[PDB]
Each structure stands twice: as C-alpha cells, then as structure tokens.
Amino acid sequence: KPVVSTQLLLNGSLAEKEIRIKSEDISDNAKNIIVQLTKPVLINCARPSNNTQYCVVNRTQWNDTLGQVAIQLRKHWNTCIIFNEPSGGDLEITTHSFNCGGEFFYCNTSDLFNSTWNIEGTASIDGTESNDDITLPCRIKGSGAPPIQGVIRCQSNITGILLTRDGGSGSGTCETFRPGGGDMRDNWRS
C-alpha cells in the first residue's frame, strides 16, 4: 500500500501568474487543500558526514511565499491565517519525506509552518532576530544499509504545498492550516 501524500510537492508544475488554491470543496475540512506556487522556492538537502543531514531553504523567500499564499486563502476566508505543524499522522504527512541521491530522508518542518498572518498583510507577531536561511534537521532510514563514504547532495524546487484546514468553532477568529493530507487520487485536472 503506497501512500501518495506529502507536505511539500517538489519539481511539479507551476501556476502561470499567481498562486492557486485548489480543493474539491474548500468548505469541507476533510478535503485536501492543494497550493500551486507561481515562483518556486529552492530547497537544498545534503549529508556531510555520518549522522548529520539537514535541508536549507532561504528564510525570506519562504516567508514571502507563505504570505502570498495567505492572501489567496483570504479570498475564501477573509481573516488572519495561521500555519501550524500537524497534530498527528504518519511519516509522509508529518514530515518532509523525500529521496536524496538514493537515501530516504525525513526532516521535520516545524519552522516552515509556524506563523500568523494578521488581517492587514503585516503578519508575523515578532520582528525576527534571525537573519539566516532556514535549517531543517533530517534523519535517514536504515536499513542497516552499508555505510556511504560520499557527500550526499540533492537539489529540488518547491512547487506546491498540501494543507488541511482546522475545523470546529472555539478556534477563534482565525482559520488555521496544517500540512496534513489524504491520498491524492484525482488531482491533475485544470
């Protein structure tokens, strides 16, 4: 049973002039929210030594991306939009789970999805102390596989994001979004 579901989509098609929010029904919190970016965010992952892997993404380009997404979401719910890490799930939707030069990487994305974009575009609550691009810690999956005496490097463009939106009521004035998902059969029409 192959689980086709993710947090980030890599190297896929791009929307032509602006970001696109797609869902079989946007009101249905149980149906997937697919984001198709218009300009991609580059992500470089690598393994220098044993027990050391991470991914890097430019912080500014990423955050500026998130904003442009939060504006498109606001076309459906005109309020403050929040991104947050998932409350549960399997590896495929709990982390960025990808193939890097053969190896199985899985990195947590807690710093990719931790922000609040308020009603005026002005967004994130605190003015940021950190100037450097974003570092996602990874781990590799065994499988007892013999050691690799190389430097592992892979280069992917982030194309889109897969989101589920919180449900219920006591949530406040905000619509919250997380990188969850269901399987993606029937996703390609336009």
């Epitope: 079989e24 029904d25 919190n29 589920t164």
Partner: antibody, heavy 125, light 102 residues
C-alpha cells in the same frame, strides 16, 4: 446488517485517561475514507469530536480543547480506529460513537452510513 | 456562531399526517439528515440533499429552498416518532422531536 464494532464502556476517575476502540471487516475498512468520532452528552445533541483518515492517519478536530486532549489513530492492518482521551472531566460524561465516511467527491457533504453501538463513558469520583 | 438552526424543536402529529422538519443553514452546503432513537445510534436518512440512504422507505424526502433544507415524512407510521438531526459538514442541528398528538 453491517456493524462497526466498538470497545466497551467504562467508569473513569476524573483526570484519568481513556481509550475507545472501533474495528471492522477488511472489506468495509477498505471502502472507508474517514472514521469520525461523535459524542452525545445525556439530554443533549450530537457533537462532532474529530476524524482520522484511514489511508494517511491524518486528523482534525471540532475544538481546540479536543485537539489538545484527544488523539485519533488507526491500524490499517487490524482495520481499527482508536480514540484516546486524557485529563477527563465531568464534561466528558457522554456516549461516544464511531462512524464511517465512504470515499466521496468534494461537495457531497458529510454522510455517515455505518455507526457503532456507542460506548458510554462515565466520569465520576 | 451559528451555522445551523433546526426547527421546530417539538412537532406533534397523528400517524398518517405528514411531518416536515426544516434546517436553515448560514451557508449553502449539502444537508444530511439522521433519525435517532434512545439507546440506538443515529440512522442515516438522507444525504446530498435529496438522496435517500440505502434501505430507507420512500416516504422520507430531502428538499431544498435557498438556504432552507427540509426533511419531509409523508405518511407517518408509528416507528417514525423519534428525534431527527440535520448535519452540514462538521455541524449538527439541535434536533427536532416527533411526538404523538392527543
């Protein structure tokens, strides 16, 4: 007819925790996109607690409180949903139902065709 | 907030006469209906807005007008006297109860 089989009732101390399980026949679990948990306090309505996807294990909740204190999991091998409540309180004394959503195209709404018999949980000192 | 308002809260009829419950939603969205007797789980009646669940008599009927979704039970038989609930996505109405009029 076809049943969703639900784990047994309990009487739990305040603050303690509780697991309610729900399982079914492979042929049925395969046709199932989501398992929802719905509760009913006595003399009250049905309140939606949350859902788990069978395929990815993804979740969602009807309230922050629920999202904090409730964990929804599945074992695709045993065709089984589990709902875990922690830090119980009298406000949790209710009958808990598991319920099924067949795979559906967006815009049909939420319809639950199968339901468990329902598990009574009593929180009292 | 309120997304669903169900009315009436109690409706009294004789068997034979026809009952109509309504459920007025704040937003357009396909309405689902359940029957509910005590000590029993809900019984799915109607989904989409007009579709009839499997093994559900012809006398149950889902209609819509604007944002007002209604359930009609046309030739009331004794078993139909129970509570009824609407559901629009994650939200349930507060429920109408059918009672016998004497």
């Amino acid at each position: 007819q076809v049943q969703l089989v639900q784990s047994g009732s309990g009487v739990k101390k305040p603050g303690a925790s509780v697991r309610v399980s729900c399982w079914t026949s492979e042929d049925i679990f395969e046709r199932t996109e989501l398992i929802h948990w719905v509760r009913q306090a006595p003399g009250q309505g049905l309140e939606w607690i949350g859902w788990v996807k069978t395929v990815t294990g993804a979740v969602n909740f009807g309230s922050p409180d629920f999202r904090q204190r409730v964990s929804l999991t599945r074992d695709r091998d045993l065709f089984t949903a589990h709902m875990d409540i922690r830090g119980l309180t009298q406000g949790d004394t209710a009958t808990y139902f598991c319920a099924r959503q067949k795979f559906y195209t967006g815009g049909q709404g939420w319809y639950f065709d199968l339901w468990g018999r329902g598990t009574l949980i009593v929180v009292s000192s | 907030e309120i997304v669903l308002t169900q009315s009436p809260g109690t409706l009294s009829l004789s068997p034979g006469e026809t009952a109509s419950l309504s459920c007025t939603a704040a937003s357009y969205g396909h309405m689902t209906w359940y029957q509910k007797k005590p000590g029993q789980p809900p019984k799915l009646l109607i989904f989409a807005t007009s579709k009839r669940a499997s093994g559900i008599p012809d006398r149950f009927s889902g209609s819509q007008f604007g944002k007002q979704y209604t359930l009609t039970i046309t030739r009331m038989e004794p078993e139909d006297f129970a509570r009824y609930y609407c559901q629009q996505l994650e939200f349930f109405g507060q429920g109408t109860r059918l009672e016998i009029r004497r």
